[PDB]
Symmetry: C3
């Protein structure tokens, strides 16, 4: 376990405790995104912009169909999914799993494609199609709202050459937004790591409409959405009607048993007439009594749980392990030169303040609280005095659950470090000479 009391003297005050959960057991739903709007009522003087747009869009969608066909031509049934690796050549585990999912989805994709005329005939942003007697499929058109709201009502009040230019500009804007996702960046359409937010770029970035139409099945919807857990996969691309079929995955957030995330608050501390800040990860992941780093940039942090779409646990150095489990001397530290580093923190009702680097007096005492040159931090609870003053904040404090004689006991202190990108090169290069 983590030794919070020893970490506090370093400057690492214990923070909130959060539970760890990852995506599992995804459900599947199929949607059709029509990437070309219907212009039946505006065709009177739509000009020649549509042929150019179709050619440009075919130039984008052709690589997608080409990258799908390699798995399409190698997936079939033999006397489950039964693939042929000779004509596949290069494939990772994720690619092969995505191909299996693609073949599985083809069973419904065939019946979806059976309604090609209905898909093309759609002229609203969201349309319901009776895909079978007991199931339905929704159709999303990229720019149908804009055409039905702005361009169509203004088809005669302005010279419709200007309307042609406006439609061309709208389509060009849509394509420029698309090219970030569906352009040559999408080298691997056979994969399910593409988030619904990115897929909605084919719909103008309005993923909320897609999710609301499909259904808010769970109460953990927002955590799944922000954490990039709701993903989709393209399973069919049509170069005649210019539409794609996307299978959207709706997973459930499953708590990881015997696992939690502990956050450590860094506080500057005094040592040798100078201020220092400890260098340890802000978030530590504990799972089944095993301490390991978690890369938290991709994960989502809430008030009670950490939500990740993938198991983002990363290895932790053994020295870091002993720094977090009591051995303070192995805990690295950095000198502080900036004057905007926190100098006190409150945890469990008791504040850990660097009472020498900031004015520090209590309230009922009406006197100052003195921090000697040997103590890194000062523990202030209501044992010494029940209300403290720090700058312009007057705060009352609760009892401490740790050692009664905390402020009278010191510890060893670790060696200094520097964490700049180029400082790493200098340190490695310099000591290499020392090694020789």
């Amino acid at each position: 376990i983590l030794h919070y009391e020893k970490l506090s003297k370093i400057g690492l005050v214990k923070g909130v405790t959060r539970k760890y959960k990852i995506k599992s057991n995804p459900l599947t739903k199929d949607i059709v995104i029509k990437m070309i709007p219907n212009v039946s009522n505006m065709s009177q003087c739509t000009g020649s912009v549509m042929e150019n747009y179709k050619t440009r869009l075919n130039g984008i969608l052709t690589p997608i169909k080409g990258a799908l066909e390699i798995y399409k031509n190698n997936t079939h049934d033999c006397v489950g999914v039964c693939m042929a690796g000779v004509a596949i050549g290069i494939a990772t585990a994720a690619q092969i799993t995505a191909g299996v999912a693609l073949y599985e989805a083809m069973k419904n994709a065939d019946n979806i494609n059976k309604l090609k005329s209905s898909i093309e005939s759609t002229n609203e942003a969201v349309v319901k199609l009776q895909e079978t007697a007991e199931k339905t499929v929704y159709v999303f058109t990229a720019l149908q709202d804009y055409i039905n709201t702005n361009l169509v009502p203004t088809i005669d009040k302005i010279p419709c050459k200007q309307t042609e230019l406006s439609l061309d500009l709208a389509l060009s804007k849509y394509l420029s937004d698309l090219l970030f996702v569906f352009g040559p960046n999408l080298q691997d359409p056979v994969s399910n790591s593409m988030t619904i937010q990115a897929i909605s770029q084919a719909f103008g970035g309005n993923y909320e409409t897609l999710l609301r139409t499909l259904g808010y099945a769970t109460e953990d919807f927002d955590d799944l959405l922000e954490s990039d857990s709701i993903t989709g996969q393209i399973i069919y691309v049509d170069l005649s009607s210019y539409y794609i079929i996307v299978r959207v995955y709706f997973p459930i957030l499953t708590e990881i048993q015997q696992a939690y995330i502990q956050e450590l608050l860094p506080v500057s501390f005094n040592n040798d007439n100078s201020e220092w800040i400890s260098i340890v990860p802000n978030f530590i992941l504990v799972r089944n009594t095993l301490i390991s780093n978690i890369e938290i940039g991709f994960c989502l942090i809430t008030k009670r749980s950490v939500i990740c779409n993938q198991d983002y646990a990363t290895p932790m150095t053994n020295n870091m392990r002993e720094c977090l489990t009591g051995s303070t001397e192995k805990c690295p530290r950095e000198l502080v030169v900036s004057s905007h580093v926190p100098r006190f923190a409150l945890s469990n009702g008791v504040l850990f303040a660097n009472c020498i680097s900031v004015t520090c007096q209590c309230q009922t005492t009406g006197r100052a609280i003195s921090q000697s040159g040997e103590q890194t931090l000062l523990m202030i609870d209501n044992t010494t005095c029940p209300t403290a003053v720090l700058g312009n904040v007057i705060i009352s404090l609760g009892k401490y659950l740790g050692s009664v004689n905390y402020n009278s006991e010191g510890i060893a202190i670790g060696p200094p470090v520097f964490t700049d990108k180029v400082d790493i090169s200098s340190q490695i290069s310099s000591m290499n000479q020392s090694l020789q």
Copy 2:
């Protein structure tokens, strides 16, 4: 303090000198952002979209008020702001300061909330309300412009079922834009480090309107705005009318006395029949004769000053200070293999170039400029000849201010390094292996 001559002989040509500026003394103004538009004039067939949007927005905003209420409950002027830390539990210095500011703003927030009916009744993008007999408050409604410009005029030209769909799509787009900032990502709404641009996402990202309506208080407006110095804080959330109160901070740019930013220009140089580029920071902070690094990626680099919303000074390795103070050998270098690395530079009118890599000839005599094999760079000035050429550029040069015999004196050059992400891991691994 920086030895520019030796740095140039390394390949680090002295660049522009800029002053250091940080924000301080922030003035405060209060604005109200209503996140639900008024649909009174278009409620004839808006449908059930409004109730669903209200439910979604209530779900979005409930955690915000839940987090604010933790502090709002435990701060009550007692026998200055006087907070109870027992029920706060977990808090940092910045969070406690933000809570103090929140309570201070509550005194005016009470009078602002006294105008709940007026805030609800707003039907314009920007509305002026008399806070007091002398003070006024501006109300910003997110989608009011869109509704009043598009949905109201086109309320009967199109079937209003389509209008309901259009309004639903617009609100969904608004919510998708919001969820980046106001969604579960906003775990800590108490803190006041959220930029005005991010807050404007609740107003469609149009922070320029927010700032212009309040007032361009100073000529340093753009530097403050880009550097993220203009920040806001949510001080009250109402779920009955779905609006928030934001206290916008307008700091002033105060230059730090006896401090400046020095920029070094890297130039590839010849050494041992090959090309190298020195590995040192592009920007160097000198403050009160103390040299320190600066994570300038978060700051703004203008022509005459560096603007930072916080003091971003970070420590610099001692060896690196020795390198910048004259110790040539302690500066690391990287072998260059790219052919698109700069090979000459101009400072104070004197030309530093690597004539081995790029051909140099001098126009006033029409003969080549020769760089010998043991010289890193060639200093070319009008002392040598008034005009030299470099490929297709003909340039005239001033006089050097350093040593007259610059080109005849050599230095000691540093040790090679590699700066790739995996190179660090490989170097550490081998360097451990040698020690064992």
Copy 3:
């Protein structure tokens, strides 16, 4: 030169082979971007917003003209381009080259400026003007389409105070979008490294319209566009009509002879009853039998080529070069702690899998595939059994081309490493302590 067979035993399975191509031989086109829209037809109720917008835009643009005038006043024909470095002061190689290009473009800029009245009289998003008897120039207005589609048609259906507010909001949104690029961030406007997508932010981000109107005539267009290969440069700023002149560069992709990019697929492998992953870059660049790294994150990855707007070759550690050329023991490895690390891969129809972590039972044999406690990965080809099963995927396999005794030969393995930044700091600091 790369020993794929030995890399497979580590877990680095050979992937796709791509060709390396860079920007070269850029063509030049001239366009005019007018950042103030023509509002002649809305002048009845335009209000006073236009004067304030003009003042804001003048404040935005004055630094740009000030920075251009440094090279404008210091460049003239001398008895090619002939610059004066005395009054330039500070300049890099890129800045000087950009200034030379700026002067070269001034010849056409004068003829463009001769049509100032025509430029300022434009009232459409894209307008064609004849700068000479033979050549023509296009004009792009930032917000003309929005005005002519929304504000003009709605000039009487709603009170024009609302129209004035709407125009002010639109201009403020346009300025908010602009300030990310054309604001104080644009410290060097002379340089030509700014992408066309960024330049289009002055046109609403519709770079597709610019490129389509300019008449592209290449099959490598999408690769050039994604890779940020198409760039522009501002060559003149007018503070009276508020327009800028941009010289757009259209290059050609030239394949680098004797150069290709090799991709390596990481696969978790068993060692000492534990699962590990190798720390080696995903992409390796080979040029004339010289191996080098590449920050391919800046580049674009396609199915058969890597496209970069600059030569992004970076040096590689010598030990690392030995690692990629058969010396297996120098390759670092990291202990897999997550349960979402790939565990099998397919290359050339040959399946590399870690049968310890994932059960393998190939259907043709009808029995499970057993991997011992000495073999890092198990090679499956149709010699041992044609079709293999891994979980839910049934795959048929080709024949190996390397050693037929692959599964019986073992290799040496490397030392463990950790890649976290804090882990790097802990590692570096710790062995300084042991070194002494």
